[PDB]
Amino acid sequence: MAFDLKTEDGLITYLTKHLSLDVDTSGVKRLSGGFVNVTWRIKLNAPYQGHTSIILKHAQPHMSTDEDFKIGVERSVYEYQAIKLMMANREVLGGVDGIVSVPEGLNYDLENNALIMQDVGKMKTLLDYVTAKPPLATDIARLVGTEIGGFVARLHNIGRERRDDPEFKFFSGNIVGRTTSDQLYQTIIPNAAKYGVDDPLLPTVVKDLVDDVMHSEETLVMADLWSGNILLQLEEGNPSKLQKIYILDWELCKYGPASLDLGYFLGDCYLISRFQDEQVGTTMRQAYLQSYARTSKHSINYAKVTAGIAAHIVMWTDFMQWGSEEERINFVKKGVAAFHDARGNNDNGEITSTLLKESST
Numbered sequence: 010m011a012f013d014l015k016t017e018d019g020l021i022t023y024l025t026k027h028l029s030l031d032v033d034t035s036g037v038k039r040l041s042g043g044f045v046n047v048t049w050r051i052k053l054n055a056p057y058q059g060h061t062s063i064i065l066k067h068a069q070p071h072m073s074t075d076e077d078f079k080i081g082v083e084r085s086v087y088e089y090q091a092i093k094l095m096m097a098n099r100e101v102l103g104g105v106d107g108i109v110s111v112p113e114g115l116n117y118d119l120e121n122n123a124l125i126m127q128d129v130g131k132m133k134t135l136l137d138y139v140t141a142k143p144p145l146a147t148d149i150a151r152l153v154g155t156e157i158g159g160f161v162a163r164l165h166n167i168g169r170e171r172r173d174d175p176e177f178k179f180f181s182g183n184i185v186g187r188t189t190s191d192q193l194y195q196t197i198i199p200n201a202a203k204y205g206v207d208d209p210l211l212p213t214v215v216k217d218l219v220d221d222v223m224h225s226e227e228t229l230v231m232a233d234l235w236s237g238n239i240l241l242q243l244e245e246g247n248p249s250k251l252q253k254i255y256i257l258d259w260e261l262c263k264y265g266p267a268s269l270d271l272g273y274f275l276g277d278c279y280l281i282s283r284f285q286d287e288q289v290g291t292t293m294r295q296a297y298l299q300s301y302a303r304t305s306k307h308s309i310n311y312a313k314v315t316a317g318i319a320a321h322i323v324m325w326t327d328f329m330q331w332g333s334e335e336e337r338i339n340f341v342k343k344g345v346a347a348f349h350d351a352r353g354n355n356d357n358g359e360i361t362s363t364l365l366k367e368s369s370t
């Protein structure tokens with residue numbers, strides 16, 4: 010039987026009894042966030058594979074607040090294998106300056122649904138920086154967009170090149186990653202409805218998004234690329250130099266359309282720009298498209314990226330609770346209109362023309 014990784018005592022018993030770790034019980038902290046995972050920071054008296062501080066993520070089989078939303082615990086072995094694969098390809102993915110990194114994966118335990126990784130440090134997320142007042146310095150925002158765009162383009166390039174390598178093909182079988190995207194797309198119609206939008210085109214839009222995520226083998230996608238999954242390490246003493254970017258939360262990593270990653274991050278940039286700081290969100294979006302387009306060996310499908318941004322806006326706007334109710338309803342309608350532009354006869358849609366302008370050489 011399993012240990013109880015949802016409680017501090019069960020976590021300490023698991024670490025000491027099942028893994029023989031030497032735990033500093035005063036340094037065990039429950040980390041906030043997550044409705045489907047319980048995350049702990051653990052200080053150790055003795056190093057575990059060279060680390061004296063670790064993070065443990067425990068995957069639950071459902072949302073804590075809604076046990077009818079099912080999500081398979083096997084996603085956790087894909088997160089472990091994904092950060093192993095990124096570390097095995099870090100020199101090329103991290104580029105000529107090595108700013109973008111991922112945490113090192115130390116252990117995955119099947120029967121306890123427990124993933125242990127390196128604690129890359131107590132850090133604020135990009136989401137914290139862009140919602141802080143005053144916001145993230147525009148110079149850092151540009152660098153962040155540039156470095157993330159380059160990392161993602163290099164991830165998509167190598168995913169295409171090594172598609173049939175076994176260690177890559179593994180992620181085509183992250184059925185929880187694919188299914189979870191399916192389930193998230195299914196919230197598009199209810200979220201629009203909530204804001205008084207009954208668009209009978211939306212069932213057709215959703216079916217296309219779902220068929221693509223369930224079946225696409227295009228490339229390796231990080232699959233949860235928004236500001237809440239990105240850590241910024243700023244210089245200690247100098248809060249104006251970016252030293253590292255850490256990309257976390259790879260449990261949905263799968264093969265899928267390249268436009269899925271672009272839709273996540275660019276969609277988040279649209280929410281940021283709309284509701285937090287226009288220059289921050291816009292600088293980040295433009296630098297991301299510039300860097301991604303230049304590094305990617307494959308054409309951006311601007312219609313599918315438009316639909317991805319649209320899906321992100323509908324799926325996430327109410328969740329974020331930014332701005333007023335009226336502004337959110339207008340923003341969601343703009344997302345719904347973008348869906349119609351993506352199925353249009355032309356690239357003249359508002360969002361599509363912005364993507365083209367900002368990605369241009």
Ligand SMILES: Nc1ncnc2c1ncn2[C@@H]1O[C@H](COP(=O)(O)OP(=O)(O)O)[C@@H](O)[C@H]1O
Pocket residue numbers: 040041042043044045046047048064066112126127128129130131134237238257258259260
């Ligand atoms: N390897 C790590 N090092 C340091 N902090 C981490 C690490 N992994 C997770 N965290 C912390 O836990 C939070 C949630 O992690 P994440 O993997 O996004 O969990 P979830 O899948 O529940 O969203 C992060 O924003 C970060 O504060």
Ligand SMILES: NCCc1c[nH]c2ccccc12
Pocket residue numbers: 044045072080189
């Ligand atoms: N971000 C809240 C939506 C959600 C529910 N289950 C998930 C699993 C993975 C990622 C997001 C979710």
Ligand SMILES: [Ca+2]
Pocket residue numbers: 210349
């Ligand atoms: Ca239409």
Ligand SMILES: [Mg+2]
Pocket residue numbers: 237238258
């Ligand atoms: Mg997360």
Ligand SMILES: [Mg+2]
Pocket residue numbers: 233258259260
């Ligand atoms: Mg997650």
